[PDB]
Design a protein around this nucleic acid. Structure first.
Ligand SMILES: [Mg+2]
Ligand SMILES: [Mg+2]
Ligand SMILES: [Zn+2]
Lengths: 128, 136, 176, 37, 125
RNA sequence: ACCUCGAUGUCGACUCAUCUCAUCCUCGAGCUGAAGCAGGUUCGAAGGGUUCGGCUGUUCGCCGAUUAAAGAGAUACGUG
RNA sequence: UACUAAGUGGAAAAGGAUGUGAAAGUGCUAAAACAGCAAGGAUGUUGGCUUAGAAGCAGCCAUCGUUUAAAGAGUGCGUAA
């Protein structure tokens, strides 16, 4: 099993999965298929390795906390947590948590909120 | 380097250090102090070494207190000379330490940190030290 | 504590006749003897397919013996019923070995020929000319012969060349 | 082998024993062997 | 404390007194994702899967007045699945969960007050 | 300033050495930022050996060529 | 009547030590204790600063929330990532 952050719009120049016995030419078309709904983003993909050289892949969301910068309206958070540079409404956090649901292993939407609350505090952002 | 600025007389007599710790007997400022178990003369150089060791292993979180201070002077006749004909010049100050005097003490930092800092300092002093916690 | 641990002496062929200082353990593979010391403080009592040893006193030496002889009895029993073995991978470039009857030889980087007498009660076998498997009755003898074989070319961290115990992870060092 | 008068563990797994009336210490890293007090 | 242990036994005993299924499973070869995945598949909030120590299980079953159920929890790692109402689906869920994974044991349990064995798990599934 | 001033002849060189190990080589071993060659440090070890010359009264030293090595000291700074 | 395993007795320091005896407390423990062994030790994170190459590990910045019996923005080892 080797995870990699293959870009969603491009898949063709490369060899570190070739030592796995992966047939690169047959899977490059598949990477550009389902990912075409979210072009221009770097999508992480899990790669299981079956003995028979069959393979099944699982795409994931764009990395957490990147979205928090957008909701805050500020390009970068504080280097010091005590310095409350930004503030975000709890309703806006609901919009963010829903996007991450496929990646998040959180049991409930209410718990999914709590998981994002520990990420908002890393940026020093107030939860209002 | 700890040193008196100026004194009255330059060549005082030696001061004994075999007693039971008149003054400085108990910890007074921190929650952990260093206590000797055998009185001896410890000079300013060792004092500075212990102070800088504690400062370096302390960090910007707490404080450290020094209790003793080299008030008494000490003479040393120069090299290659017959005795007699006056008394030698003063060379190095020294703090008299009677057995059982708190002399170093720190505070406001984790407990194992007091233990490690005081043990680090104690290996620079000639006297056989002992860790003491502040009373309740 | 191992000292008071129930030894399950299965009555397959293991018979244990106790003397003043002899313990003769015999089985399908071969008789094994244990030389007891004078005035051993342990007390050896055996029940039907059950063996248990007890200490007369609580002194430190008796406490030690209570475990050492329990372990030795268990080891002798398992050896006489099953037999131990050690596995050697003699890996290298020109490194190889084979057996000439009672005497095993080795071929290493030595300009000198190496021969090693196989003692009594031990059996050696070479599946692959670079692969050795020593088989014996007592753990002590087979281990002694294994380290005797190993002494001629110890493993080194730079290259895997040398005599290596089976299931051993040797350290690695990179020299340019 | 480090013949040092004050032996103390350096690694976490460095265990100290007393073999032949001489305290020592053994670690998987052979750079920590000590002896003699 | 003695009180804390008694409360845990009493709570478990009371739960087993209203259950429609108690099924005993070895927790061997169960990954953290598998622990969350099996619980997630058990979807409907009427069922639980928990690794429970044998001594608690034994006292709880004993005080719930269960018998011959000791063998399921005897000398083995023992997670428990306990469901409510329609209990049959829970057994199929755990049976298809192992099969999807490398392995897992399914010792047996009680279904609607009736003992079943390990072999009978397949019948129910 | 304690024995010797009604005398204990003091530097160096030559001859003969003997002893200690805090080891220079030969001997055994551990570690290494020890690939090998070559090393560095440490442990064990006193059985044996430890060069020839220029300058200086010289020990000491500098230099030259060597050897496996050109050890550190003690013996009234061994030895009229 | 105890203690000593060192010829301690029958010389000596700073310091180190699961030597060993005694006493006073204190924790767990038979609804099972410690050690060993068999399983798992997860998610948001490949967070960002930055190094062809730093993404749990070249270092640095707050360094936490969630699922769960369990869990470190990873114990250390160990990777150009
Ligand atoms: Mg005369
Ligand atoms: Mg003459
Ligand atoms: Zn170590």
């Amino acid at each position: 099993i080797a995870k990699i952050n293959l870009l969603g719009g491009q898949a063709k120049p490369g060899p570190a999965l070739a030592s796995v016995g992966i047939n690169m030419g047959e899977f490059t078309k598949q990477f550009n298929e389902k990912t075409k709904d979210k072009q221009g983003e770097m999508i992480p993909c899990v790669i299981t390795a079956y003995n028979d050289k069959s393979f099944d892949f699982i795409l994931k969301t764009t990395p957490v906390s990147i979205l928090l910068k957008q909701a805050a309206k500020l390009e970068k958070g504080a280097k010091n947590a005590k310095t409350i540079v930004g503030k975000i409404t709890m309703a806006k956090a609901k919009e963010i948590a829903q996007y991450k649901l496929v990646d998040l292993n959180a049991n409930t939407v209410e718990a999914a909120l709590k998981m994002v609350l520990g990420t908002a505090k890393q940026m020093g952002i107030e939860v209002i | 380097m700890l040193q008196p600025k100026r004194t009255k007389y330059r060549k005082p007599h030696n001061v004994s250090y075999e007693g039971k710790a008149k003054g400085n007997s108990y910890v007074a400022f921190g929650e952990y102090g260093l206590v000797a178990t055998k009185g001896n003369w410890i000079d300013a150089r060792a004092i500075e070494s212990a102070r800088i060791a504690i400062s370096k292993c302390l960090g910007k979180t707490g404080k450290m207190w020094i209790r003793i201070f080299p008030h008494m002077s000490k003479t040393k006749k120069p090299l290659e000379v017959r005795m007699g004909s006056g008394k030698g010049n003063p060379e190095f100050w020294v703090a008299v330490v009677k057995q059982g005097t708190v002399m170093f003490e720190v505070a406001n930092i984790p407990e194992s940190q007091m233990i490690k800092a005081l043990t680090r300092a104690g290996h620079k002093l000639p006297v056989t030290w002992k860790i003491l916690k502040r009373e309740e | 504590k191992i000292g008071n641990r129930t030894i399950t002496l299965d009555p397959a062929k293991v018979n244990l006749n106790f003397q003043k200082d002899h313990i003769a353990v015999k089985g399908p593979l071969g008789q094994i003897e244990l030389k007891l010391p004078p005035n051993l403080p342990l007390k050896f009592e055996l029940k039907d397919n059950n063996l248990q040893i007890t200490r007369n006193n609580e002194l430190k030496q008796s406490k030690i013996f209570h475990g050492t002889y329990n372990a030795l009895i268990t080891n002798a029993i398992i050896g006489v019923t099953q037999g131990f073995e050690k596995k050697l991978r003699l890996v290298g470039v020109g490194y190889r070995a084979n057996v000439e009857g009672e005497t095993l030889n080795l071929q290493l980087g030595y300009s000198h020929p190496i021969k090693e007498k196989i003692p009594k009660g031990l059996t050696v076998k070479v599946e692959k000319n670079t692969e050795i498997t020593i088989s014996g009755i007592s753990k002590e003898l087979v281990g002694q012969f294994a380290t005797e074989v190993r002494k001629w070319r110890k493993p080194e961290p730079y290259k895997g060349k040398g005599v290596l115990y089976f299931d051993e992870v040797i350290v690695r060092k990179a020299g340019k | 082998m480090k013949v040092r008068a004050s032996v103390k563990p350096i690694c976490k797994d460095c265990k100290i024993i007393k073999r032949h009336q001489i305290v020592r210490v053994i670690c998987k890293t052979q750079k920590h062997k000590q002896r003699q007090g | 404390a003695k009180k804390d242990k008694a409360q845990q036994v009493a709570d478990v005993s009371h739960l087993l007194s209203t259950s429609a299924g108690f099924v005993i499973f070895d927790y061997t070869s169960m990954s953290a994702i598998e622990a969350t995945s099996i619980r997630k598949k058990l979807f409907k909030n009427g069922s639980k899967i928990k690794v429970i120590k044998n001594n608690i299980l034994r006292r709880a079953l004993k005080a719930g007045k269960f018998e011959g159920i000791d063998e399921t929890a005897i000398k083995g790692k023992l997670a428990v699945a306990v469901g409510v109402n329609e209990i049959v689906e829970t057994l199929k869920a755990v049976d298809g969960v192992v099969k999807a994974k490398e392995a897992m044991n399914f010792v047996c349990g009680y279904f609607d007050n009736r003992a079943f064995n390990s072999a009978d798990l397949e019948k129910i599934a």
